[PDB]
């Protein structure tokens, strides 16, 4: 509807939908939503030629070549030259109208939010302006590579105070308690469903992102699409929200691990934030890290080469870990740094040797060689204070190295054991109070107004420890950051606890109680999770921690430490006996140290004599009769 100029523009838009034949792949009714959005931002900061410019921007958001963008700006631009295209960049009368953004960009206005150390290169500013040009209309989805920072750009734009970037990181079996939210009771009452993360962003602002929705748990996808029936109305028993504008973004991945719905991929104004360029990253790391001309440049080139040799790990978040970790001042030392950080996740020696060549193109305990290259890595990652997982064989040395470091760095390794409430009690509790405070209320009344007695509590209630008295919340990592938290078997941990741990992870701690933000004096989450309900976390939540993978006669020496006083050479038989049992039964060259451990237990529990008969009955008890 809303000149003969616009009739020439009708000819231009028709030329665009006619040059649809320049090859799904910019399908039919995308032009309809594009015309709707052109109508949307029409008077709101727009020339009609600029309206079609921003419109066909979202006709070529997810594309291959910008010669279509060249012809599209040629059409719209012609309807509206290099000076004219610069006049399209005049945001001045556009922004004259809602907290504005930089250029072709004046969004809405909310917590007062401001900038960051999030320095932006050319292609980054391009995609940022793209997502911004999306972010004035009102759904939106943004697929691609995870290490390239989709929510990095999303929060870089949320820095301009559209809202906060509530990154709901659904891993693999995220249920409705993550989305709709339910909560603990009260001081006395019940209060079953008393919180939210999606519905909280539905009531308030704080622009949510149901991230990683590629691996959705197969029904919250369905109820979330039920929430994409109405605009911002959420029925959960209790009817609706009807929000103001924050955003409603979402992020799948580079698309066969459970491919998303094409109906869902045709119900939102989608986007494809493709990977950042190479020298783009070379510039990007030069400020957020300390910069070296060739150490930094070659690391980016090595990331490119690791891409060039090509669900394992190649995350550039770990490249930032490699950068800020490397305190080298030496190209060989930095080579070893990027090596070992890349040699963290080595699930096989083949790819380890391959990456080694690619980089080459650029105390109560017992010492041991094959665990020294776990203890040294955990020591180094402790010095960097990075988040440090540990993955591998169930019973390989994990708690040993952890207690070894807590021996060496004198510390209080508060350990835990996962698989409800105690997972929250890693962060915080709410138990019934040990009633020493019930008698401390007598001193609290002795420090109370109008004191000369529960009748005195009534008298001070006439004119908050009284409410503490009427009510009858610490935690393990709260105690840790107060005073290393080794939450072993982290794969079977919680999700909301893992959510706050993700908030606890990246270079900052937080105590999401009415809440605060905890400090960190060395509150390491020196966790573990053995390989293999062994559902891994979000690939961010894996990638947000510097992991480590792990696996001779020293097993016999270890048993010699593990055994009784004299009682010696039976294990030297028992070691090779386990070896021949291993190659014979269930053929593999693993010492299977649960078995040898229980055998050393019974052998040091031999209340009888005749050593070889003890080992006879022992290997009968553990290995032999099991077969
Ligand atoms: N421009 C930038 N400036 C500084 N750091 C950046 C920048 N871009 C990315 N990063 C960092 O690189 C990582 C990007 O990953 P992240 O910000 O988690 O996005 P993401 O992995 O897609 N999270 P999500 O989208 O919810 O799955 C983070 O550690 C950022 O701090
Ligand atoms: N060099 C060593 N010095 C002392 N003990 C060792 C050494 N190497 C291995 N061990 C022991 O071998 C076992 C290795 O298990 P470890 O992973 O450390 O704890 P774990 O509980 O068995 N792991 P997991 O069972 O998966 O939770 C422990 O009993 C260690 O004491």
Swiss-Prot record:
It comes from the Eukaryota. Residues 363-607 are annotated as: AAA-ATPase protomer 4. ATP binds at residues 144-151, 392-399. It is found in: Nucleus; Nucleus, Nucleolus; Nucleus, Nucleoplasm. Residues 115-358 are annotated as: AAA-ATPase protomer 3. Nuclear chaperone required for maturation and nuclear export of pre-60S ribosome subunits. Functions at successive maturation steps to remove ribosomal factors at critical transition points, first driving the exit of early pre-60S particles from the nucleolus and then driving late pre-60S particles from the nucleus. Associates with pre-60S ribosomes in the nucleoplasm. Belongs to the midasin family. This is Midasin. It comes from Schizosaccharomyces pombe (strain 972 / ATCC 24843). The chain holds residues 735 to 1468 of 4717 of the full protein.
């Amino acid at each position: 509807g809303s000149n003969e100029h616009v009739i020439r523009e009708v000819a231009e838009l028709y030329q665009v939908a006619k040059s649809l034949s320049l090859d799904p792949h910019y399908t039919v009714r995308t032009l309809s939503r594009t015309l709707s959005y052109v109508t949307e931002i029409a008077p709101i900061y727009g020339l009609r030629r600029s309206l079609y410019e921003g419109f066909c921007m979202s006709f070529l958001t997810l594309l291959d070549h910008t010669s279509e963008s060249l012809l599209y700006n040629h059409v719209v631009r012609f309807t509206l030259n290099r000076d004219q295209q610069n006049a399209i960049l005049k945001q001045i009368p556009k922004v004259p109208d809602y907290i504005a953004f930089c250029h072709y960009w004046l969004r809405r206005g909310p917590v007062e939010e401001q900038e960051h150390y999030i320095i932006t290169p050319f292609v980054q500013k391009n995609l940022l302006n793209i997502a911004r040009a999306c972010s004035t209309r009102m759904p939106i989805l943004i697929q691609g590579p995870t290490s390239s920072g989709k929510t990095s750009m999303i929060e870089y734009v949320a820095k301009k105070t559209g809202h906060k970037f509530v990154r709901i990181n659904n891993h693999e079996h995220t249920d409705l308690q993550e989305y709709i939210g339910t909560y603990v009771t009260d001081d006395n009452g019940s209060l079953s469903f008393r919180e939210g993360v999606l519905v909280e962003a539905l009531r308030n602002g704080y622009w949510i992102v149901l991230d990683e929705l590629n691996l959705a748990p197969t029904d919250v996808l369905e109820a979330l699409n039920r929430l994409l029936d109405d605009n911002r109305e959420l029925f959960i028993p209790q009817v609706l929200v009807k929000p103001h504008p924050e955003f409603m973004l979402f992020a799948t991945q580079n698309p066969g691990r459970k491919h998303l719905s094409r109906a869902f991929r045709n119900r939102f104004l989608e986007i494809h934030f493709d990977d950042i360029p190479e020298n783009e990253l070379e510039t990007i790391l030069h400020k957020r890290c300390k910069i070296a001309p060739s150490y930094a440049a070659k690391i980016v080139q090595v990331f490119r080469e690791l891409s060039l040799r090509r669900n394992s790990f190649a995350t550039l978040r770990d490249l930032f870990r490699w950068a800020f970790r490397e305190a080298v001042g030496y190209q060989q030392l930095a080579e070893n740094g990027y090596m070992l950080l890349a040699e963290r996740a080595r699930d096989q020696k083949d790819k380890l040797a391959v990456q080694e060549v690619i980089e080459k193109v650029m105390s109560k305990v017992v010492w041991t060689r094959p665990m020294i290259r776990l203890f040294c890595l955990v020591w180094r990652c402790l010095l960097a204070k990075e988040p440090v997982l540990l993955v591998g064989d169930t019973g390989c040395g994990k708690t040993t190295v952890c207690q070894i470091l807590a021996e060496c760095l004198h510390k209080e390794l508060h350990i835990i054991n996962a698989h409800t409430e105690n997972g929250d009690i890693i962060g915080a509790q709410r138990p019934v109070r040990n009633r020493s405070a019930v008698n401390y209320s007598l001193h609290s009344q002795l420090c109370e107004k109008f004191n000369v007695i529960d009748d005195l509590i009534e008298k001070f209630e006439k004119l908050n420890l009284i409410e503490r008295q009427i009510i009858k919340h610490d935690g393990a990592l709260v105690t840790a950051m107060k005073q290393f938290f080794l939450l072993d078997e982290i794969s079977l941990a919680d999700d909301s606890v893992l959510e706050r741990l993700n908030s606890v992870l990246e270079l900052s701690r937080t105590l999401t109680l009415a809440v605060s933000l905890t400090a960190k004096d060395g509150f390491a989450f020196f966790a573990t999770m053995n390989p293999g309900g062994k559902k891994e976390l979000s690939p961010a939540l894996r990638n947000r921690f510097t992991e480590i993978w792990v696996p001779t006669e020293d097993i016999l020496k270890i048993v010699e430490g593990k055994l009784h006083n004299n009682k010696i050479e039976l294990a030297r038989p028992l070691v090779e006996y386990a070896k021949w049992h291993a190659n014979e039964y269930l053929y593999t060259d693993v010492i299977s140290i649960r078995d040898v451990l229980s055998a050393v237990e019974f052998i040091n529990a031999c209340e009888i004599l005749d050593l070889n008969l003890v080992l006879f009955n022992a290997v009968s008890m553990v290995f032999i009769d099991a077969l």
